[PDB]
Amino acid sequence: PYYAFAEPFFIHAITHLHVGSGSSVEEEIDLPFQRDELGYPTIYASSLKGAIKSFLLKEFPDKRDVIYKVLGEDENPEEASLGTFLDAILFAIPS
RNA sequence: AUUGAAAGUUCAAAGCUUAGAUACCCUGGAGGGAAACCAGACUUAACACCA
């Protein structure tokens, strides 16, 4: 029980997604999608956390303190955040 | 021909112990796969006349 809760989830792209890795030199796709250490599309947990946290701080203005906890205080860190995202593995892609 | 002569600050000793470069952070915002372009040009040859 190192982790209080563990919540796996699937991320279903409703519309098309663009999560960028910035411009590279070994790509011809100037705004590429975030790749993997194998070449598969990925969503870095920094991108997951940033999007979910920012979104959460707007849907739940009442529970702002609970989120500046587990996700992070976001202004002067002063403490590690209790939550943890894992880089989103590509499960299945429409081909 | 000197209150002189003679006498090794010598010996033993670990800068050791405890200690996470950790914490906060969306590769994002802006950007019209457009611009130009005739589905068009032309009858010929043989021929009985003419010659």
- SS3 letters across A11-34: CCCCCCCCCECCCCCCCCCCCCEC
Q: Is the CB of A80 under 7 A from strand B?
A: yes
Distance CA A26, CA A59 (A): 39
As given in the structure block, the two tokens for residue A71 are 């996700």
Q: Is the CB of A20 under 7 A from strand B?
A: yes
Q: Which nucleotide lies nearest residue A51, CA to C1'? A: B26
Distance CA A50, CA A26 (A): 27
- Which residue type sits at A20? G
Residue/partner pairs of A30-39 with CB below 8 Å, 24 or more apart: A36/A89, A36/A90
For A27 and B3, how far is CA from C1' in angstroms?
Answer: 100
Distance CA A7, CA A16 (A): 24
Q: What technique solved it?
A: cryo-EM
Count of other CB atoms within 10 angstroms of residue A49? 16
Residue reference for tokens 């209790």: A82
As given in the structure block, the two tokens for residue A44 are 């870095």
Residue reference for tokens 């792209």: A13
- Resolution of the determined structure in angstroms stands at 2.8
